[model samples]
Structures are given as structure tokens and as C-alpha cells.
Target chain A: TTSQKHRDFVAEPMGEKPVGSLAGIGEVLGKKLEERGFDKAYVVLGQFLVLKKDEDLFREWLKDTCGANAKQSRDCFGCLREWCDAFL
Target chain B: MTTSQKHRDFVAEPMGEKPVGSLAGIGEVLGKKLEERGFDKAYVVLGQFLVLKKDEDLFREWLKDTCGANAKQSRDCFGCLREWCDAFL
Candidate 1:
């Protein structure tokens, strides 16, 4: 479920939020991302914008980067997509 | 020159494929270095800013380390990008 975390993240500009704040990131996936230099939510958002916000490419990259499952990737992607819609 | 003509022009629209030099404070010297290091476009640098979570200190430090930007240059560039994000992103 894209629940509270997704809603919270998409509600405003993601200023300086940690990677774990992203929906579906949780502690494990967030740790993996941090190890790879994506320590902040906006870092992943950087990748999202760099990919021109494409759904497929963003999803694939998220999964490859942090071993996210399908549901996890979907939730994360939807979170970013909605955030972009409202803010970007 | 935080509100320089260049800064205003850059913040006025989507960055698209504008060269890194098009960013305020990124003159030819800094732009050359950034371009050589794969940040040739404004959007690419914007990626870096977002990656830094728009923190003034981190982005300024990264700018200095990446391209030898002076404090003033870094501040100007940071402000420009921050304003752009506030306006567009």
C-alpha cells in the first residue's frame, strides 16, 4: 500500500529528507541506497529527473540499485510520480 | 550577483538542455571544468543540487570541489538553482 509515507513524501518539496523517508525504501533498501551515495531522498529524485521521470526507466533503476521487489518499486515509483506532478 | 541578469534568465524557465555555463556564476572557466566532468548541461548540475538535497553548504562545497568555484560563485549558483526549484520544481 502506498500509504502514509507516500502521502507524506508527495505532499511537499522533499527538502533534505533522508532516503528512508521515501516510500518502500525502509531501512534495508535505504541503507543499500546510502552505500551507493544516494543518502538523501532528493538523490533518488535526481535520478528520477535525470531519467526525465520515465516510469519504466525509474522503476528498473530503483530495482537494480536497491533490490526492491515489484511492489516496493511500484510504490516508490508512484510516490515520486505524484510528487513530481504536484511539485515538479 | 545573486540577482544578475543571467540568474533571472535561468530561473525564468525550464532548464532543458541549456549548457552548464548558462547557469548563473558558472562562467567559462567553471563551465569548462564541469563539462569535462560530465555535468555539461544545466539539468545535470540540477541533478547534483537535488542530490545534495538543496543544502546550501553541501552544494557549495561540491561546486568548489568539482569545478574550483569560489565562495561567491558557489553562492550565486546555489541561489539561482534554489530559486529555480522553488519556481519550477
Candidate 2:
């Protein structure tokens, strides 16, 4: 299910929003991301772009970075993908 | 100057694989330093900017520390990327 968070996130420029604002990045995942210096959504986007926006790579990276499960990673990946399509 | 011709040109399009020197305020000297440190492309630098959450002060200081950019040079480069993101990111 596409959460409202995903819709809201993909709808705009995402300027300076916190990592928790991204779909599938709830408190636990957000805490992990913050620990690794990715407190901001744009920082995660940086990683997404640096990886050239490849789904496999991004999903693997996210999983490894924060222990995101398949569904969580997919949700996050889709969120970023849609946002990029609309605004990247 | 608030914005350079270089700045306008850079902000006008996706950075793609443009060399580090292609960024406004990052002329040959600084670009060489950045390249040596593995920021060979403009996108890599943009990665750093986004990582820093686009904080102007942090980015300016980082530009100075990373490649010896002065105030105006760092300012120009920051503005260029900021505008690019506003337009396309």
C-alpha cells in the first residue's frame, strides 16, 4: 500500500526534510540512518544519486546500512524513484 | 557579483558527468584539488552538498577545506548548486 507519506514525499522538492519523513523509514530505521550520518532525507537521496539510482544497488545498500527488510526497502526505493521521476 | 555567468550556465542543466571544474567557482586550481581527492565530477560534489543537508555555512566551509576555495568562490559554487536543486531536484 502506498502510504500518504509516500505521496507527500514524492509530491515536492524534499528540501531538508528529515530521513524519517521518507516512506518506510519509521523510528527504528530512522534511528539507524541517523546513527550513520543520514539524518536528512536529502542525504539518503545523495546516496541514491551517487549509486546512479540503480534499484538493486540502492535496495542492497539500504538493507545493509539499516537492516531494512524487503518490504521496507521496496517502499523506500519506490518513494525515492517516484520523487526522482517527478522532480529529479 | 551575486551570480556569475558560470553560475547561470551550471544551474541551467543537469550536471551529468561534467568535470569538477564545470561547477561555478571551482576553476582549474580547486577543481584539480577536488579531483585528486576523488570528487572528479560535479555530481560527487553535489552528493556532498546534499549530505550536508544543503546548509550554506557547512557547504561553504567544506568547499574551503576540501579544495582551498575562498569565500566568494565557495559562495558562488554553493549558490549554483542550490539553484540547480531548486530547479531540478
Candidate 3:
């Protein structure tokens, strides 16, 4: 897992951060997500929240939605989960 | 028309400081009770939505318990927030 990006993404309000800003969501997956309407970090958070932050479910959806791998989905879910703990 | 207009207004911004009534289907009456119960603002409701993990059934049931929203009203409010998240979450 990319700990640095994870920490950075969970640090504060997502505001208008781009989808690519999430840990493990780089240019390629970001582009795909954006094209499919997950253009912003909050948009992805919406999906995360909608899924109830279920680890396995979110991981599978992430892979199916954007081809993210095991580490990527887990890291992204961890980032949002921590952020929700602190902020939501 | 009115519902969509309200939804547009809400999704137009980051929901900063908007009143509960600003949400679609949350009229003055529902808004008052929500305010009384600490859900005075749209953002607070959004917080609960996030906390509930955005489950439609759970959210709807919660809404009914929170402020006596009927089935249609609950569904409408849920859809409003769901669409808002789609556009601005």
C-alpha cells in the first residue's frame, strides 16, 4: 500500500480534489473513473459510502469499475474509511 | 419542476450552510423537526447519509424515523441526495 498518498488523501476535506488524488488511483484508473462519472474524490467517496465501506465489496467493485488491484482497492478504502472516521 | 429545481440548487454548490429545507422533499415542516433533532442543515443530513453508508433502504427508514417522512417523500429525499452525490460528492 502507498502509505504516503493514503495519509495525504485522508488528511482533510476532499473539497474538489480530482479522482486521481486518491491513493492507488493514478492516471489510468483515474481517467477511466472520470470518464464514467467518478471524476472527483468525493464522487468516489459517494460510491464508497453507498457500498457501506464493506471491504470485500468495495475491493471487488473497485477492481470491476477501474481495474484496481488488491493493494490499490484496500488502500483507497482505508483512506476513505479513516477520513470518514475523522470527518464524517 | 420544483423538485428538480431544488435539487439543482443543492447540487449546484458544495451544500455549504444550506438549510434542511433546501433539500428536495424536505419541506418546512420536515425541516423544522430535522432541525429540532440536530439535522438542521443539509450538510448534517449528508453526514448521516455518509455514516449510514448510503444504503437506500436504511436511509429511507432512518428518514421516516427521524422526521416522519412517508414512502414517497423518503424516496424523493434519498434520490435527491443520491443524485447530489453523483454530481458533487
Candidate 4:
């Protein structure tokens, strides 16, 4: 599952790095996110945990905003969730 | 020096059990106001910060809207949130 991979990737501190380090975020979605002021994965992390990582809503929002599919959105959500469990 | 001191202390680690008054410019009066407005804890303020998407202007505006904080007070509160997020989030 993308859950473990995503979790391992984001489970630590993200200095000032770009958001593209997140799973399910390709150059396309990453660019879209960056353009909207979400450069660091932490910024998106803030939004992710802030929404309490609601799978359905987050997936819907990601899909609506960047056309991320269900699988992609779920992978990303899992990534952020595990990170929060460890660091947040 | 409270600005830098508070910001430094806040950005150094997780807020954990810190008080709302620990934020820059948030003294007894503003802290009481924040508590009266249902933000008795730093975590609650952090919740609001996240809800505001961490935007400085929006967050500062929120401080004013929630507890009638002036510009300096709002700046300090917003600064606290920003630093906390920088270190913790």
C-alpha cells in the first residue's frame, strides 16, 4: 500500500523542502499546490492534519483541485496521517 | 524583547502545555479575552491557526475578530502561530 511508503517518507521533519516529496504528488499536483502557496510539504501537512485527515473530504478536495484520483488522494492522505502520528 | 524571546521560545519546540499568554504580546488582558472567547489553551489557538491556513493576514484578522486584539497584539499572536508552525508543523 502507499500508506507505509507515504508514512515513512513524511514521518519525519521536513525542513524547507518542496511539497513534491509527498507521495501521490507528481510534478503536476506539486506545482498546483506550490502555486497556491503550499511549497513545503509541511504547509500541506498543516492543511491535511487541520482537516483531521478526513479521507473522503480530502480526496474530494484534492480531486476537485488537482484532479487527483481516489487512489492518489488516499495515498497522499495516508502519507500525511502517519507523519502526524509520528511528528505532530 | 518579548517579541524575540517569545518567538524564540515558541519556535524551539512543541508548545505542549504552554499557555496562551506565552505568545508574544498576549498578556493577562488578551489572554483573558482569548479564554473568554473559548480559546483558553494554546492548542485551541493552534487549531484556529490551522483553520486559517496559517495565513498571516487572515490569522491576524482572526485574532481581532475573536477577541478584539489590536494590530500589535494580533501581530504577536500571529507571529507566535507562525513560529510554532515553523518548528512543530
Candidate 5:
């Protein structure tokens, strides 16, 4: 089942949410991504769009960028995927 | 009141399936180039913009490299997308 993070994130438009609000992106990983210029969740969304929303590629880059494991990466991807579906 | 008006129009509404020409600095020529490269839709370009994390430098370079956008063209396109994102993204 999904956690509160997922529920909370999907609950509203990701207009100005932090990257940490993404499901798999906790404080530490979010800090790493933020330091690398992904301070906002939309920046990560940009990367997702750039990869053309490819799950495999997003997962690979997510892991390489900040070390999200399979499950975590998938959670992040799923969250973004649905966000796009709902909003983008 | 040039194609910049188009830019306003684009940023004005939801870019559901508009063609690449809808973007500022993307005239028919650049539009064709972008379409040939598979970025035919506004959303696809928006995807690239997002993929680049909306960075001005990277997006400008990408617009130039991808579709031979000149400095003004890239700047216009970048500004338009940034505005659109500000309102929507």
C-alpha cells in the first residue's frame, strides 16, 4: 500500500512542492537532489519529461542520481506518472 | 505585436496538443525541424524544458542544438516556457 507521502503528494497540484515531498525522496535523498539543482519537485518532473516518461530510464537515472533502490524508485516514478496523468 | 503575441496566447491557455510552432521562436522552419526530431507537440517541448529542470542555460543550449535556434529564438522560447510553467507547472 502507499504511504501518506504518496497520498499527500497526489492530493493536490504539485505547483510548488519540494522534492522531499515526492514519495521516495526523503530528507537525505531530497537534500542530495536539491543540492544538485532539483530544489523543487517540478525540476525532477522536468527530468521525468525529458526521459519521455520512460519508467526504465527514470528508474536508472533516479538510482544513479541519488541512489533510490528499485522499490523506492518505482514509487517515485509511479507518483510522477500519476501526477502527469492527473495534472500534466 | 509580432509572433510574441503567439507566445502570450500559448502561455495563456492549457497546451494540450498544440504543435511545436505554437512555441515562441519556433517558426515554421524550427517547427518542422522539431517535428522531424519527434518533438512535434508543445507538451514534448515542455517535456524537454522540464527534463532540463527549466534551467535557462541548458534549455537555451538544447533549443539551439536541437533545432538550430539562434540566441534570440532560444531566449524567446525559453522565456515563453518559463512563463508557461510559472502559470501551470
Candidate 6:
């Protein structure tokens, strides 16, 4: 689901939008991230690339930062990873 | 001379195939350092930008770490990358 969802979400240019628009970031995780100053998708996108788009490292960081489970972490990372492939 | 001349020219547009030295702060000396460090092309620096999440500080730090760039070199390089991204990204 994250894979397909990733494809559908980031296939086009993301010209300044909310981070919640990304897959796997429901209201809960999205809100937590926003509270931690990740209000914009571009900011998070920067973090992803800064982490070198490494899956395990990124997933662990996301989970620890937001208390997301493994599934949620994978879902989010997969979404971002695919998004990069398509656009970045 | 190296940083200014190269910088102005590069800020004008997308640097598709421009040599790595085309970046403002990267002179022949620094460019050689960068090349020795495996950053032989402009695109590799782009990869660093993408990797630093486009953060000016981190990118500048990278320049310092990679080639002992001073503050001026870092800013010039950051400006070059920022403008390039504005044009292309």
C-alpha cells in the first residue's frame, strides 16, 4: 500500500504543500511532526535526502522521532523514496 | 578572481555539463581537491545539496570539510547552488 500510495502521491511536482499530504502520515503523526517544527513537506523532504535516502536509518529515525511503528515507518519511507524517484 | 568570475557565470542558469570548477568557490586548487575527493562533477555537488536537505549551513560545512573552504567560499558556493536550484528545482 505504501508503494502504490507513494507512486500516486509524488508523481507530480510538489510546489509547496503540507507534509501531511504524504502517505502514511495520518493526522496523528503529521500533527506530532508539525509540533516538532516539520510543518512543511519540503522540510521533511530535505531531511530524507540529507539522510541519504537510506531506508533503515530513515525508518528508525522517523519511528523514534514520532513513535511510529515499523509498518508506519516503512510506509512513510517508502512513500518518500518513491516520491524522490519520480520527481527529485 | 576564481570565485567571483566563476560564480557570476554559473548563477546565470542551469549548469548541465559545466565542469565541477564552474562553481563559484571552487578554484583550480579547490576543484582539484574536490575531484580528488570524488566530486569530479557539478552533479555530485547537486547530490550533496540533495543530501544536505538543501540546508545552507550543512552544505557550507561540507565545503569546508571537503576542501577547507573559508566563509566566503561557503557562501558563494551556497548562493550558486541556491540559485541553480531556483532555476532548475
- For this target, which candidate reaches the highest TM-score against the unseen true structure? 5
Model 1 chain A poorest ten-residue lDDT run: A46-55
The model with the greatest DockQ is 5
Question: How far off is each candidate at the interface, as Cα RMSD in Å?
Answer: 3.1, 2.3, 7.1, 3.5, 2.0, 4.7
> Which residue pairs in candidate 5 collide?
A46-B50, A46-B51
User: Model 1, which residues run further than 4 Å from truth?
Assistant: A1-41, A49-61, A70-88
In the range A1-88, model 4's lDDT, one tens digit per residue, is 5545575586677655577888888899988887776777766665664454567877787787677877778778878767666654
What is the C-alpha lDDT profile of model 4 across B1-89, one tens digit per residue? 54678777776777655677877778899899988876776766776676566778888888888788899888887887777777766
Q: Candidate 6 lDDT, tens digit per residue, B22-47?
A: 88877888889988886777756766
Chain A TM-scores, candidates in order: 0.95, 0.97, 0.93, 0.83, 0.94, 0.87
Q: Give residue A18's error in model 1 in angstroms.
A: 9.7
Q: How well is each residue in B28-67 modelled by candidate 3, as lDDT tens digits?
A: 8899998898777776687667546577998899999999
Expressed as tens digits, the lDDT of each residue in A1-88 for candidate 1 is 5699999999987777898988989899999999998998888988886676778988999999999998888888889888877765
Docking class of 5: medium
TM-score of 2: 0.72
lDDT of residue A61 for candidate 2: 97
TM-score for candidate 1, residues paired by index:
0.66
Clashes of each: 0, 0, 2, 0, 2, 1
In the order shown, the candidates' DockQ scores are 0.37, 0.45, 0.07, 0.19, 0.53, 0.15
The local lDDT score (0 to 100) that residue A69 gets in candidate 1 is 90
What pairs collide in candidate 4?
none
The segments of candidate 2 whose C-alpha lies over 4 angstroms from its true place after superposition are A1-12, A16-18, A21-23, A34-37, A50-61, A74-86
Give the TM-scores of the predictions, in the order they appear. Answer: 0.66, 0.72, 0.55, 0.67, 0.83, 0.64
**Global CA lDDT computed for model 4:** 0.73
Task: Give the winner by DockQ: 2 or 3.
Answer: 2
Sorted by DockQ, highest first, which candidate order results?
Answer: 5, 2, 1, 4, 6, 3
